[PDB]
């Protein structure tokens, strides 16, 4: 629909990558350049939805690539981003280690500026659009407290951490809100042949991830039967606007986690094409840059 469509490559074909495929297809200003996978994954049978899709091991085999959408594991992502920025390719990621965002942002900023590229990081569900809402609440009521309650949903960094433990064949870890920003964790574990529940319970409950947090552990026959990739996020702020107390704000979403996250990353890919070289979180970009359409028509429709 646009003259020269944006050519988007998907790096890593996991949960995020599969939904990102659909988001790129629906994007009227974008066309799929291809999917980049590990060589090991290239040797498994080709997924049925990737028929007619260029699936390679390096971005150089896909021709021109405007933006790379990084659907890779968290710890693997900054290094992959730096590599692609250095090739002059824009990068979108949903890096979700909050304490490392400032540092990672600086490192990507320097590489991006050196190669006339734009990196948008932490552009997912949380961090991402929830961060944008959170920041808007902040300046509407500067004094007060915001509570971010991550509703019942799967934590895939906690699930694989419970899987690496001695005695667990498979595991599902859930993040559960208990109010005022506090969270409870519940772990469903499929045990190995002949391991006892009582000990493996005490190795998860004393694992560094679940010692200072309230944690419940249950043994189940099939953890795969319990998996659903939906999640909820509820944010509350009670604050002061100017000098007037008791301003009340509530934001809630009930969404498919990877579907939404991939959509935000695709919308951010659109925004990346409109920025000066550098690295940005989502609160550093005009909201209109994430939207497709004529500027005046968007203002007429939304403002
Ligand atoms: N910001 C948010 O609100 C939020 C929410 C959800 C997810 N995320 C982020 O999104 C990331 C991906 O989540 P997911 O559910 O899609 O995970 P996933 O299903 O495990 O997908 C990981 C994919 O990355 C590739 N990969 C795995 N190991 C790799 C390695 N060592 N080196 C290079 N590539 C590797 C693999 O694809 P191939 O087989 O094709 O190589 C794999 O399919 C997470 O790490 C998380 O940080 C953020």
Written in H, E and C, the secondary structure of 189-233 is EEECCCCCHHHHHHHHCCCCCCCCCCEEEEECCCHHHHCCCEEEE
- CA dist 123 and 112 (Å) reads 17
Resolved by: X-ray
Pocket test for ligand 1, best of 9, 18, 72 (most atoms within 8 A of CB): 72
- Count of other CB atoms within 10 angstroms of residue 88: 14
Query: Measuring CA to CA, which residue among 117, 188, 125 is closest to residue 151?
Result: 125
Which ligand 1 atom lies nearest to the CA of residue 122?
Answer: 1
Query: Measuring CA to CA, which residue among 94, 100, 136 is closest to residue 257?
Result: 94
- Nearest CA residue ID for atom 2, ligand 1: 124
Tokens of 182: 């506090």
- Nearest CA residue ID for atom 32, ligand 1: 76
Q: Given 3-state DSSP classes, what are the helix, strand and coil percentages for the chain, each rounded to the nearest 5? A: 40, 30, 30
Instruction: Pinpoint the residues of the chain covered by CATH 3.30.360.10.
Output: 148-231
Stated in angstroms to one decimal place, the resolution of this structure is: 2.7
Query: Measuring CA to CA, which residue among 137, 174, 182 is closest to residue 155?
Result: 174
Which ligand 1 atom lies nearest to the CA of residue 73?
Answer: 45
3-state secondary structure 107-160: HHHHHHHHCCCEEECCCECCCEHHHHHHHHHHHHCCEEEEEEEECCEECHHHHH
Longest dimension (CA), the chain: 67
- Could you tell me which CATH number the domain at 6-127+257-302 has? 3.40.50.720
- CA dist 293 and 28 (Å) reads 10
What's the CATH class of domain 148-231? alpha beta
Instruction: Pinpoint the residues of the chain covered by CATH 3.40.50.720.
Output: 6-127+257-302
First to last CA, the chain: 25
- HSE-CB at 303 with a 13 A cutoff on CA atoms is 8
Query: What is the arrangement of strands in the sheet containing 143-150, beginning at the earlier edge strand?
Result: 143-150, 230-241, 244-256
The Å distance, Cα 168 to ligand 1 centre, comes to 22
- CA dist 106 and 112 (Å) reads 10
């Amino acid at each position: 629909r646009t003259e020269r469509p944006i050519r988007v490559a998907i790096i890593g074909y996991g949960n995020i990558g599969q939904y990102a495929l659909q988001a790129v297809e629906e994007a009227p200003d974008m066309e799929l350049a291809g999917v980049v996978r590990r060589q090991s994954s290239l040797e498994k049978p080709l997924p049925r939805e990737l028929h007619g899709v260029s699936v390679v091991s390096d971005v150089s085999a896909l021709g021109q690539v405007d933006v790379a959408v990084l659907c890779t594991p968290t710890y693997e992502t900054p290094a992959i981003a730096k590599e692609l920025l250095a090739r002059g390719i824009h990068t979108i990621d949903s890096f979700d280690i909050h304490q490392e965002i400032v540092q990672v942002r600086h490192e990507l900023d320097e590489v991006a500026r050196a190669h006339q590229a734009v990196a948008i990081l932490a552009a997912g569900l949380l961090p991402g659009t929830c961060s944008m809402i959170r920041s808007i609440l902040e300046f509407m009521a500067p004094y007060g407290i915001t509570y971010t309650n991550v509703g019942p949903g799967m934590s895939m960094s906690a699930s694989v951490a419970v899987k690496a433990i001695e005695g667990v064949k498979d595991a599902l870890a859930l993040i559960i809100p208990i109010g005022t920003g506090l969270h409870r964790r519940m772990v469903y574990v499929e045990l190995e042949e002949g391991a006892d529940f009582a000990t493996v319970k005490e190795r998860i409950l004393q694992d560094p991830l679940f010692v200072h947090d309230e944690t419940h552990v249950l043994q189940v026959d099939d953890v795969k039967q319990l998996i659903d990739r939906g999640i909820a996020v509820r944010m509350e702020r009670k604050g002061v606007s100017g000098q007037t107390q008791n301003q009340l704000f509530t934001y809630e979403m009930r969404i498919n986690n990877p579907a939404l996250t991939s959509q935000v990353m695709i919308a951010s890919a659109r925004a990346a094409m409109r920025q000066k070289p550098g690295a940005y979180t989502m609160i550093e970009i005009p909201i209109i840059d994430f939207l497709y359409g004529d500027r005046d028509e968007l203002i007429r429709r939304l403002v």
